[PDB]
Amino acid sequence: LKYNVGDLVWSKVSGYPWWPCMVSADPLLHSYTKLKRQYHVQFFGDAPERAWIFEKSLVAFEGEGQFEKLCQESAKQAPAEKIKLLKPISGKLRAQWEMGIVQAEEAASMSVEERKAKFTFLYV
Numbered sequence: 001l002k003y004n005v006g007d008l009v010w011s012k013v014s015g016y017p018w019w020p021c022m023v024s025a026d027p028l029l030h031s032y033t034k035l036k037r038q039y040h041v042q043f044f045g046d047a048p049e050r051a052w053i054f055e056k057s058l059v060a061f062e063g064e065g066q067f068e069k070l071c072q073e074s075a076k077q078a079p080a081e082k083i084k085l086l087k088p089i090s091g092k093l094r095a096q097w098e099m100g101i102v103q104a105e106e107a108a109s110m111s112v113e114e115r116k117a118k119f120t121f122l123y124v
């Protein structure tokens with residue numbers, strides 16, 4: 001198993017730029033991994049988003065400097081209209097992504113247990 005709870009990963013979800021996030025357990029399947037292999041991630045930032053991500057869309061987070069290669073490869077690897085599916089980041093989205101980056105670098109400087117304490121979403 002490539003990742004475990006509290007791992008920081010870049011996650012690619014169709015329709016969004018490559019986004020900092022954390023491996024975490026799904027609130028109602030109480031699992032962080034499964035075979036549909038997928039992993040469950042919380043996306044960092046002010047929106048409390050979460051998703052199941054195929055491992056091929058998951059890259060271990062080292063830091064913001066990985067963003068350019070991720071973005072450029074993903075549009076490089078596209079089978080023309082597929083390459084076009086690579087759209088701009090508005091000012092509002094960029095600030096939301098910059099927020100998520102700031103959380104992810106904080107999280108990366110604590111331990112897995114401190115960042116699990118600080119960043120795990122609270123559910124009903």
Ligand SMILES: *[Se]c1ccccc1C(=O)Nc1ccccc1OC
Pocket residue numbers: 014015016017018070071085086087088089090093
């Ligand atoms: Se990853 C990146 C870097 C710089 C500009 C745009 C992107 C990007 O991937 N944008 C994408 C890709 C797919 C859907 C939407 C969207 O931008 C919102």
